[PDB]
């Protein structure tokens, strides 16, 4: 997700941040509304247990 | 699930031409090119045996 959400809702974070490169998360979000609020884990992404 | 039988574009039968196909690309050391030895000059349908997935050996093993 990205709680939130109820605190805009204009840009930020939606927009793609240089930071994403790698754990990207490339360009694969929903059409409108929740753009860039949902994201997907890259192929190499590893999340910290 | 199993070869389509009859190519999508032409009529060229392909139900017959697989029990024999698979017995070359893994049993005769000939290339993907070997199908040419099955009368596949057109694109066409010949991307039929080639782009196919054997989804039945891996489905048949669910016995009721």
């Amino acid at each position: 997700n990205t709680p939130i959400g109820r605190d805009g809702k204009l840009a930020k974070p939606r927009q793609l941040h240089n930071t994403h490169w790698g754990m990207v998360c490339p360009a694969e979000t929903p059409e409108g509304q929740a753009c860039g609020l949902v994201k997907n884990l890259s192929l190499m992404s590893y999340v910290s247990v | 699930m199993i070869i389509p039988i009859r190519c999508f574009s032409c009529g060229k039968v392909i139900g017959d031409k697989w029990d024999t196909y698979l017995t070359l690309l893994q049993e005769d050391n000939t290339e993907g090119e070997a199908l040419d030895k099955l009368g596949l000059q057109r694109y066409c349908c010949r991307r039929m045996i080639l782009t196919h997935v054997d989804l039945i050996e891996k489905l048949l093993c669910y016995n009721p």
């Binding site: 204009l10 840009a11 939606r14 927009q15 793609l16 941040h17 240089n18 930071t19 994403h20 490169w21 990207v24 490339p26 360009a27 979000t29 059409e31 409108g32 509304q33 753009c35 860039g36 | -």
Partner: protein, 360 residues
Amino acid sequence: IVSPQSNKPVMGIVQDTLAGVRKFSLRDNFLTRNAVMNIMLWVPDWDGILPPPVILKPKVLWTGKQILSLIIPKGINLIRDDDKQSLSNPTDSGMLIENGEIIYGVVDKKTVGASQGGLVHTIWKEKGPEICKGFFNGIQRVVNYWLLHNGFSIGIGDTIADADTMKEVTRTVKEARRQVAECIQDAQHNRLKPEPGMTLRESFEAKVSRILNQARDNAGRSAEHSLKDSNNVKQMVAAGSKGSFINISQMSACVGQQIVEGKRIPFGFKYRTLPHFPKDDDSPESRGFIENSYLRGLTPQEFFFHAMAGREGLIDTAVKTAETGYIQRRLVKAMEDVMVRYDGTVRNAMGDIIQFAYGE
């Protein structure tokens, strides 16, 4: 077919029937007597009389303009007069119709699309919808029928610029590196300068997005100026049907540089665009700016820059989808009130009058 929003038409020949018109209104396209005939069965209201042939020489041939001007009403005039145009032809340049017959230039969006003095506009409006309503039925029927047997299409070849003339592309791009070199290092010796609007760091950013943007045009302008006139996608454009000069240059020449909130790829994290670059790398070879087109085409260190510029007009399109609607209702909810009273005046709900004309 003509909203008063703009006292201009809102529908017109578009898409394939349009691409088709050009590629058929050419005076290079003759019609075999063999049909003609066939294509005469659309009109749909046919005189019954078969048009007097324009060519009586060895074969009997019909010009593509001839049988086209058939589906236009009788007695509508137009003097389009485009840019360069002479007592001569000089070369199918411009457009001009007489007693419902064209004689001059070539039909494209310029004339069968919602244009100002548009041909669509001009029979509407003389003499009202229909045969007006038939106009769209004729051309959009005749031409579709022509095109059916004329064939038209596009492949990659239509996207791959001449090999020789592509050397000269890559030359004027890498020859605009030197134009940044003389900026990345010359504005480290405080010899800019800046002004106006400020600031100094910004008036630098400016003198670059300016060189990068203009430098691109040269590569694209040359890429097209070197493509046979009869090159699909280039003709699809000349027609007007779909897409534009900036679509070709980006497909066969370069692409970047891409933007974002009015500033080339922003930094952060740290003082760098990405972790494949030094620090303070105010160079295009990194900050959003591709050198290749969707043919080679894009490089990793680039691919991303493009996708994240893409995700901006990808949310700016998410807004206009709602907001635009919100603002709409505002007006309505304050203007429903008004209407034109039988007196020749526009008045409020309560009678409070807002205009003394019908719109001045």
